[PDB]
Amino acid sequence: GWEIPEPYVWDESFRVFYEQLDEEHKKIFKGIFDCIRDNSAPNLATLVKVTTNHFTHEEAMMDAAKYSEVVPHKKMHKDFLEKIGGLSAPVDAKNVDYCKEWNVNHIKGTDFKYKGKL
Ligand SMILES: [Cl-]
Numbered sequence: 001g002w003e004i005p006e007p008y009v010w011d012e013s014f015r016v017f018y019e020q021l022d023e024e025h026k027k028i029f030k031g032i033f034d035c036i037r038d039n040s041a042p043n044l045a046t047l048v049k050v051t052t053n054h055f056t057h058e059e060a061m062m063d064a065a066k067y068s069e070v071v072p073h074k075k076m077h078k079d080f081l082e083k084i085g086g087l088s089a090p091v092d093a094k095n096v097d098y099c100k101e102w103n104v105n106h107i108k109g110t111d112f113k114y115k116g117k118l
């Protein structure tokens with residue numbers, strides 16, 4: 001799987017070259033980093049909010065582009081929001097690692113498929 005950054009921050013190897021989506025990816029790294037250091041109910045709900053907003057915006061750009069790999073991508077999105085929308089603070093160590101892993105793997109293994117296609 002790809003390297004999990006420590007400290008958990010965004011870096012350039014995650015760039016997709018669509019400014020607003022890259023800003024949103026940066027905020028999801030920050031959302032998870034904040035949950036890790038302050039595992040609170042506000043921080044978890046912020047992570048749910050920023051991730052939902054990002055997934056709606058990324059899916060709106062894939063649909064506008066008639067990007068042909070949008071439906072398995074949308075299911076990936078739906079499953080992750082279902083997972084973190086069901087969590088409650090403090091998130092245990094296993095689910096924190098799940099989120100860390102999932103965000104890295106999702107950007108590089110699935111969002112990278114739309115590079116230059118949106
Ligand atoms: Cl890499």
Ligand SMILES: [Cl-]
Binds near residue numbers: 116117
């Ligand atoms: Cl093309």
